[PDB]
Amino acid sequence: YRYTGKLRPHYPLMPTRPVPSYIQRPDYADHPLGMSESEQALKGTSQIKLLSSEDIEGMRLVCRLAREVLDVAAGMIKPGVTTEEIDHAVHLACIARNCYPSPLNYYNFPKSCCTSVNEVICHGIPDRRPLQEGDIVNVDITLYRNGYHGDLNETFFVGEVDDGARKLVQTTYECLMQAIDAVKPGVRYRELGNIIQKHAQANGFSVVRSYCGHGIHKLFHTAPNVPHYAKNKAVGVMKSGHVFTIEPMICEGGWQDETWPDGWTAVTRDGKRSAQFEHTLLVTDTGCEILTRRLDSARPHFMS
């Protein structure tokens, strides 16, 4: 395999971390291949679930807990810390909140969160590599509590970073927020990508096309599929009660992605940097509720 950039995996990985049996587990947690039968049963369907008052409360709780865990991860970002150490802290933080770390064994993913550094677009596997001054790193968190999944991610600066890194991360965050500001009943899901690409392209960046936002509630990933690029064929119209994520992945160079031999790590084919931000949203009557928002601080960690 020919690596696209300077990053390399740092093995070996620690044995998979166990989750106490008292914590409720999603169906794929015990499947030998980590398959989710509930999700597969809906593969190919574009119908979007309309959440009940009970479902909404469940989503509000898990998303609040997920934010708490991402904040724990944020507090550990500093030169020298390895992504595996971040993952260990995340794992314990989920357990402390009586939640199962959704990524764990999802289709056999080996860790409890995704850590994506520099050229890694998404799904980076926490390993033995110490973060380096100048790196940008995204930590993607998803928790499962009482049958509901809550998902979010933020990109962080490791120590001091260059101007290119600041522009990329800032622009990516703006892309997500401009998309969120457009969410409300009546809007076509395919419209979000037009908004996102417009801002990214205006700043000389590209939009990853192989990964999209997704419905989320009792299932980790389900309808609707939400592309982040312009002129996509996303199916569906927003309606009060819909819950889904927007998680734009923006790149310094081209949008092309490829996967590492580990089967998960997605990287830019040109080896340039990528950044991402994600929130889980609930469509209301007026607009939308950002379920994974910070409640005690006005801005994301990179500008705090």
Give the shortest CB-45-to-K ion separation in angstroms.
32
Binding site for Co ion (CB under 5 A): 140, 151, 153, 245, 247, 278
**3-class secondary structure, 207:** strand
Cα–Cα distance measured from residue 147 to residue 62, given in angstroms and rounded to the nearest whole number: 9
Q: Partners of 156 in the beta sheet?
A: 137
Given Co ion, K ion, none, residue 151, with its beta carbon under 5 to 8 Å by kind, binds Co ion
Q: Which is nearer to Co ion, 278 or 289 (CB)?
A: 278
* 116 close to 123: Cβ distance less than 8 angstroms: yes
133 among annotated binding-site residues? no
Q: Which is nearer to Co ion, 140 or 289 (CB)?
A: 140
Choice from 4, 112, 115, 116 touching K ion (CB under 5 A): 116
Q: Which is nearer to Co ion, 118 or 222 (CB)?
A: 222
- Does 115 participate in binding K ion (rule CB under 5 A)? no
In this structure, the number of other CB atoms found within 10 A of the CB of residue 11 comes to 10
- Could you report how far apart the first and last alpha carbons of the chain are, in Å? 39
- Does 265 participate in binding K ion (rule CB under 5 A)? no
Choice from 142, 274, 280, 292 touching K ion (CB under 5 A): 274
- Does 268 participate in binding K ion (rule CB under 5 A)? no
Identify the burial level of 98 via C-beta atoms within 10 angstroms of its C-beta, where 0-12 means exposed, 13-18 middle and 19 or more buried: middle
247 among annotated binding-site residues? yes
Best CA proximity match to 58, nearest among 165, 149, 153: 149
Given Co ion, K ion, none, residue 257, with its beta carbon under 5 to 8 Å by kind, binds none
- Does 206 participate in binding K ion (rule CB under 5 A)? no
* 19 close to 28: Cβ distance less than 8 angstroms: no
Give the number of residues in contact with K ion, rule: CB under 5 A: 3
Give the shortest CB-200-to-Co ion separation in angstroms.
18
Binding mask 17-56 for K ion (x = CB under 5 A): ----------------------------------------
| Residue 285: both structure tokens together | 């009557």
123 among annotated binding-site residues? yes
Give the shortest CB-259-to-Co ion separation in angstroms.
17
Given K ion, Co ion, none, residue 140, with its beta carbon under 5 to 8 Å by kind, binds Co ion
Give the shortest CB-225-to-Co ion separation in angstroms.
11
> Cα 197 to chain center, whole Å?
18
Cα–Cα distance measured from residue 272 to residue 118, given in angstroms and rounded to the nearest whole number: 7
Cα–Cα distance measured from residue 1 to residue 71, given in angstroms and rounded to the nearest whole number: 35
- Does 102 participate in binding K ion (rule CB under 5 A)? no
* 63 close to 280: Cβ distance less than 8 angstroms: yes
Identify the burial level of 31 via C-beta atoms within 10 angstroms of its C-beta, where 0-12 means exposed, 13-18 middle and 19 or more buried: middle
List contacts with K ion (CB under 5 A): 116, 120, 274
Binding residues: 123, 140, 151, 214, 221, 247, 278
Binding residues for a protein: 123, 221
